[PDB]
């Protein structure tokens, strides 16, 4: 919300530098998207932290196709390694949350998820502002991290485990790009 | 700090260095505390050295381990042959004294008065003249004992007979 100053944190303040908020109704649409994109991209960043660390389940993801959990790539192509009979299950459960349980039509972003004494907002309202800003700020940093993780695999061809094993962290002197 | 316990018929308020030429009572009562803290240890250390140099021992068997009291040497070498299970007990109990029961718990009427109303061997039967010289005695007895005990250890490592 604008009046509490939820997204405006202390390094930059009200960081709308290109002038996109020209009234109050288009802020609530944009914050509903920013908070939703931040919640998706945070679980996307914890995915790449877990996948590129090699932490896999034991057994077969698809035993009728013989596809182990170990032979899914930890990079940007690992989701499509998965058989489409299997990730139709992912789209159908996540689509059921998006329409019924956590309806993404709710622009407020509240879905009542309260983990009680870890947020007693009625007796410490400063913890409300701390946890509301940190949901956006960790979502904004993970939105740029997953755009980092995606394009670093595209321009190098290696995933994050492979380009860190090679020490390939500089776009200069390598055989890739015109630099 | 002209007339109190350190003021003295041979040398009244000696003070050569730059310690207390001000009115800071809290500086003085800290330094007065440690001077009898060093004196009360060193008084028992003069006696505690000269019973070991005279060869007097406890009747034997400092441990179940087969080490007697006469086997333990005298001077700085006593520290190396005391069994380490018992040398923890010496440091733990002296630490138990120095933390808990050695204090101005209840408030004495001077510095170093550690009678908490628990143990008192008199101190009412004095004529208010004799109290302050009888702790000016133990200040000066503690004064000479720490130059006494420092002489016994500088000359043990030197080897000079005293």
């Amino acid at each position: 919300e604008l009046e509490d100053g939820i997204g405006a944190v202390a390094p930059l303040g009200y960081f709308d530098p290109l002038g996109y908020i020209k009234d109050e109704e288009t802020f609530i649409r944009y914050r509903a998207v920013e908070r939703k994109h931040g919640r998706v991209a945070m679980m996307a960043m914890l995915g790449t932290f877990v996948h590129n660390n090699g932490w896999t389940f034991d057994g077969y993801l698809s035993p009728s196709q013989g596809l182990k959990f170990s032979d899914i790539d930890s990079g940007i192509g690992g989701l499509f390694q998965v058989p489409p009979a299997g990730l139709a299950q992912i789209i159908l459960l996540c689509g059921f949350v998006e329409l019924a349980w956590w309806p993404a039509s709710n622009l407020s972003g509240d879905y009542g998820v309260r983990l009680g004494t870890l947020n007693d907002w009625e007796e410490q309202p400063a913890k409300y502002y701390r946890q509301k800003n940190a949901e956006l700020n960790n979502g904004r940093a993970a939105m740029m991290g997953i755009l980092g993780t995606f394009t670093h695999e595209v321009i190098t061809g290696q995933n994050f485990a492979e380009q860190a094993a090679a020490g390939h962290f500089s776009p200069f002197g390598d055989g890739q790009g015109f630099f | 700090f002209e007339n109190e316990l350190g003021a003295q018929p041979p040398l009244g308020f000696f003070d050569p260095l730059g310690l207390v030429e001000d009115g800071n009572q809290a500086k003085f009562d800290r330094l007065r505390y440690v001077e009898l803290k060093h004196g009360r240890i060193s008084m028992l250390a003069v006696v505690g050295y000269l019973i070991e140099k005279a060869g007097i021992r406890l009747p034997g068997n400092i441990s179940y381990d087969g080490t007697s009291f006469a086997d333990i040497p005298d001077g700085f070498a006593a520290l190396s042959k005391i069994p380490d299970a018992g040398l923890f007990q010496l440091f733990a109990f002296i630490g138990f004294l120095e933390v808990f029961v050695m204090k101005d718990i209840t408030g004495g009427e001077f510095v170093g008065d550690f009678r908490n109303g628990f143990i008192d061997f008199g101190w009412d039967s004095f004529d208010e003249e004799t109290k302050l010289k009888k702790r000016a005695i133990e200040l000066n007895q503690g004064r000479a004992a720490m130059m006494g005990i420092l002489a016994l250890m500088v000359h043990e490592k030197l080897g000079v007979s005293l």
């Binding site: 701390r130 020490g167 | 380490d84 040398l87 933390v99």
Partner: protein
Amino acid sequence: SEIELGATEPLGVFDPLGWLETEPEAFERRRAVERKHGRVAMAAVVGTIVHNNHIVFDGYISPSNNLKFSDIPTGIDGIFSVPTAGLAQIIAFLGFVELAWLPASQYDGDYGVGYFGNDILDPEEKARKLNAELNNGRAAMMGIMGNMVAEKITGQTMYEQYAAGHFNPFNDGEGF
């Protein structure tokens, strides 16, 4: 307020140099230095237990240097065996934490996060944990200093010394 905390029962308000009555304008920075030196030493003491228990991560901290995490010594020479490009990455991030996230020019030490996130609702349950941070912080200052001088005097780290049973300084080969 802040001038009565740090003063617990066995001594009270303990200032043998008397700088509370003499220079009260320098106290709240000196409290901030005491709290920061405490919090640094508490993570430093805990680090020495974790290092000397041989809890290492895996692999190489610097694969160009061919230097594993277990190749790091567990004593004083451990942070200096890390390569200089690696030490520059620690200090650049710790300067980002100590100037931007937890700015150490903020002298009350209060950075938005509470005690495990929560603000202590009571005022003297707050003062009890404010004293427990200071007292554990003051105890860890002597703990990390007592671990650094006792490594460089005995020549061994804390695993090395404890393996050897070199606990008694009176019957070994040392000074006195």
